């Protein structure tokens, strides 16, 4: 039996740190996909 | 996050491993050092 908080497992990521990296990463893709273009992110499509 | 004790990784059939229960609350801190990414095939390549 579970003794404690009744909760589902969870993963924490700091909003500031992930974003800062994202801003730096998204610029590297534009060294290939071109100076100016729209890059949208989305979760997994589907599968196992 | 979801928890699964019985796993078949690497598309293994014939052998399934059961992850044994752990006493107390588990806490872990790791570094995220990189990603595995895929690009969509729908194009509209010159758009986004």
């Amino acid at each position: 039996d579970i003794i404690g908080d009744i909760r589902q497992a969870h993963c924490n990521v700091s909003k500031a740190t992930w974003n800062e990296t994202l801003g730096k990463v998204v610029k590297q893709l534009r060294k290939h996909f071109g100076n100016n273009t729209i890059i949208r992110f989305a979760n997994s499509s589907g599968g196992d | 996050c979801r928890i699964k004790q019985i796993i078949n990784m690497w598309q293994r059939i014939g052998q399934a491993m059961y992850a044994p229960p752990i006493q107390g609350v588990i806490r872990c801190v790791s570094n995220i050092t990189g990603l595995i990414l895929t690009r969509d095939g729908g194009s509209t390549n010159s758009t986004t």
Partner: antibody
Amino acid sequence: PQLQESGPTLVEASETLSLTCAVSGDSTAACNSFWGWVRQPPGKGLEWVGSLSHCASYWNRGWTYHNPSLKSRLTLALDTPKNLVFLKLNSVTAADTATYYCARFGGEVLRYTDWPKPAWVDLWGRGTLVTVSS
Amino acid sequence: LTQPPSASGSPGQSITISCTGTSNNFVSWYQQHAGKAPKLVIYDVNKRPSGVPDRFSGSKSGNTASLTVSGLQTDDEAVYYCGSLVGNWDVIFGGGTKLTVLG
């Protein structure tokens, strides 16, 4: 399950009141209930003192609850191996004179959300009278 | 919590004592005989504990909580306190209701 209170029945004013509860038939390690005290001044109503529990979560080494008014002058402690409860009151006055009962707190202790929520005392002790005089 | 100061009834009659200030369901009632230790006669509103007669029933309507004792008897003469959890983890008690089954 029996709760036996022990300590000085006569304490001088401004001194430190110390009381110790000895549990029998149950373990203080059990996460099903909180352990604390409830004092009842002579011919008066029931007042909540506080309770604690070593059964913790990932961000703490336990839980300890103090009554906002009595918080400053009290200290709560639990001995898990020896199965004992402790209460220490600093700077005690004749106003703190009461019949002290050893209390077991039931509630949302065994399955809580966020913090644990103890709401009612299921098991009581016989209690002793402590008179504070200067 | 506001509990009525006194309450009286004849043997066999049913008494209902109230309590107010409870916004939650953590309400519980206690019975303390004079010169003795208090005993919990009810918890989580209506729910009864072990070795407690059916005639004791808890009830809460709106901001008002109520305890009901039917079929009064000599041993029912005592002081009855109510209590409930409030806010995060603090708990408070009412003034208590004194119920007497004296002659």
